[PDB]
Design a protein around this nucleic acid. Structure first.
Length: 180
DNA sequence: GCGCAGTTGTGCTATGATATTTTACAACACACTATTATATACACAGCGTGCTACTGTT
């Protein structure tokens, strides 16, 4: 082994606590998009940490694109400050990470059909529909996308340890189904 | 109201044997999904660039 998964995307939610006028928000923000007809939220962005926020009239906000939990909270506080600077009585509350995505490379090809047959109740593999095997782990409850190349995607985690836990649990199985 | 003469209507049509063949429309309420990110990869469609051929001019 020796491989440890790399975090790729962190999704979080934040309650600003006050109602927002989206045209005002979009108008005053330096990096905003807002087309009511397409989606009901201002799509705001900041350069550091590089992230994207979906800002709603209710004052709720979704922050995505961060590569670390630190970066997620940091960028979230920053978006909240922007809203304040524009003039609303916003508050940075209820910061919570909802989804963590990770990925790695085991460095060997995998026999997906064998794995799907062996771990049938957790696996779903339809190569004509999507080339990767969808593995639904029980403990921890994580979803893994397994590819012939040996590249692995882990998602559905609320905490970093779950990403790490799942990979540790899957590695022996990937080894059992290697090609070379 | 009674009798008579049409029409309808109702049973059955030999004994045993052997061999195959399949009600509508409108309104209201409740449930479900676009949007944004991330690794992943196979696929398909379009766009751009390069090469070859044909036509025109010297």
């Amino acid at each position: 082994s020796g491989i440890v998964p790399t975090l790729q995307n962190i999704v979080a939610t934040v309650t600003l606590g006050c109602r927002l006028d989206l045209k005002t928000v979009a108008l005053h923000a330096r990096n905003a998009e807002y087309n009511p007809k397409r989606f009901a939220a201002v799509i705001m962005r900041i350069r550091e940490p590089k992230t994207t926020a979906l800002i709603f009239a209710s004052g709720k906000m979704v922050v995505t694109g961060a590569k670390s939990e630190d970066d997620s909270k940091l960028a979230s506080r920053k978006y909240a400050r922007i809203i304040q600077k524009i003039g609303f009585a916003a508050k940075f509350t209820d910061f919570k990470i909802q989804n963590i995505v990770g990925s790695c490379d085991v460095k060997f090809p995998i026999r997906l059909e064998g794995l799907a047959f062996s771990h049938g109740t957790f696996s779903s593999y339809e190569p004509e529909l999507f080339p990767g095997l969808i593995y639904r782990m029980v403990k921890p409850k994580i979803v893994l996308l397994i590819f012939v190349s040996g590249k692995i995607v882990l998602t559905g985690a609320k905490q970093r340890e779950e990403i790490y836990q799942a990979f540790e649990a899957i590695y022996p199985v990937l080894s059992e189904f290697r090609k070379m």
